Amino acid sequence: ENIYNRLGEDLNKWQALLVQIRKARGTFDNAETKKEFGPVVIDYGKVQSKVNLKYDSWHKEVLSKFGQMLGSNMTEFHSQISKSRQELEQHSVDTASTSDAVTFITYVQSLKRKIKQFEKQVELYRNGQRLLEKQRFQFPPSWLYIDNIEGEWGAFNDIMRRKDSAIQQQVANLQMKIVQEDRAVESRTTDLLTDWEKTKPVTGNLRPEEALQALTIYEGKFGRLKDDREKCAKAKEALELT
Amino acid sequence: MCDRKAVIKNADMSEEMQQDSVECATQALEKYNIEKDIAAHIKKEFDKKYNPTWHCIVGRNFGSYVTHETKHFIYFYLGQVAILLFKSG
Amino acid sequence: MCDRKAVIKNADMSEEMQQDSVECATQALEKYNIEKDIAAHIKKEFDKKYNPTWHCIVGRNFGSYVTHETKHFIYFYLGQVAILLFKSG
């Protein structure tokens, strides 16, 4: 508990621990059992074997911890592949719900870094798990083996970059769609400006309640126009190519 | 029982179906001595189990490159036997 | 050109594409030294010519039991190298 708390969560540090304990055991290696000094004889081998077994048990139990976060990276793998299948099948150049599309498009860029992140984790992992077999692990089927998953991650990355990039390039149609959409938004904005100038009920002769209802209708359609303008602007900045 | 560790080598499938593969292939290797027969038993069992269609190879020296259905592929080792099982069809 | 006389063990497909498989496998063997690469090359070539989804197996010792669509199956030997090419997808 003490050493684990001091280490905390650090995989590379953990690999350093393992190489350190391995080299410590190796340096401990000896054959003599009794260092006689002068006429004085001392047992040396009994405690030698005992502490060697202590090292072995300690090193083994230390190894035992890592499998759990290995399961973590496993779940990361799974969550990636099972869901990325659906997500690649999802979007298309058409489907003027492009906003959501470009939303996910922005999403996938946000993922790219994490990809590299996960990738290097896998690299660290693919090193530590190697120790696992030369530390003689009983890899229980329970967990995926090598590319058992891996291969699947490589497949994942390649499939993402094959099609997502392409569909990102075919966006000029979406670009001009956004262009005409915002143009219609500006036209409706000018129309609503003119309607507001016409509709000014500022005169006191009008009944407060009826003109209130008319202003409520105006405000409903005005909030609708505001929603249109803000959604067009946010789609523009999310797509950010236009 | 001869404890032949099953090295689920490469895979696009769930963990339960891979362990079912390991168990079924261990059973086949205990039951038959012919690689063609091992592959036949494994393929027939999985055809009965997860609905067609699979392709299974059992052997010592073979290299492969195919297309399978997603979540429906495994390749592993039992003892000195490499076993590939992928679904495409 | 090393006359590795192709001996055909099984075939459910036309003589023209039989010869096509023999020629493509000979080209792959002359070009590649890894069985997996030979299988990938033959699979890719047959994906290009006779359309996916093909599946190719190259090896010296393997047992196979697969389902294939009609008119798209071959299993033959070039020297000691057995090659099983069948369509499934």
CATH number at residue C88: 3.30.740.10
* Substitution target from A145, A146, A153, A157 for chain B, most B beta carbons within 10 A: A145
Closest CA to B12 of A69, A154, C63: A154
Give the distance, in angstroms, between the CA of residue C57 and the centroid of all CA atoms in the same chain: 7
Domain count, chain C: 1
Residues of C with CB under 8 A from a CB of B: 34-40, 43, 52-53, 55-67, 88-89
Determination approach: cryo-EM
Query: Rounded to whole angstroms, how far apart are CA atoms B47 and A72?
Result: 32
Supply the DSSP symbol for C33. Answer: S
| Chain A interface disruption, residue of B3, B4, B7, most A CBs within 10 A | B7
Inter-chain touch A144–B11, beta carbons under 8 Å: yes
Of C68, C55, C62, C54, nearest in space to C81 by CA:
C62
Give me the domain span that covers residue B46: 5-89
**Residue A147 token pair:** 């590319």
Q: Which residue of B has its CA nearest to C65?
A: B40
Counting as contact any 3 or more CB pairs under 8 A, the partners of B are: A, C
> DSSP string covering B2-65, please?
----B---EEES-HHHHHHHHHHHHHHHHH---HHHHHHHHHHHHHHHH-S-EEEEEEEEEEEE
Chain C residues in contact with B36 (beta carbon < 8 A) = 63-65
Q: Which chains reach chain A with 3 or more Cβ–Cβ distances below 8 angstroms? A: B
Smallest CA–CA separation between A102 and chain B, in Å? 26
Rounded to whole angstroms, the Cα distance separating A105 from A212 reads 44
Q: What stretches of chain C adopt beta strand conformation (E)?
A: 7-12, 54-66, 73-78, 81-87
Cα–Cα distance, A149 to A81 (Å, whole number):
10
Q: Are A108 and A88 in contact (CB under 8 A)?
A: no
What tokens appear for C56 in the block? 């190719």
Whether C64 and B88 lie within 8 Å, measured CB to CB: no
Question: What element of type H or E holds A131?
Answer: helix A98-134
Q: What is the rounded CA–CA span in Å between residue A24 and residue A68?
A: 25
C61 → closest Cβ in B40, B60, B89: B60
CA angle C32, C33, C35 (to 5 degrees): 95
For residue C33, the tally of other CB atoms under 10 A from its CB is 8
Q: Do B11 and A82 touch (CB under 8 A)?
A: no
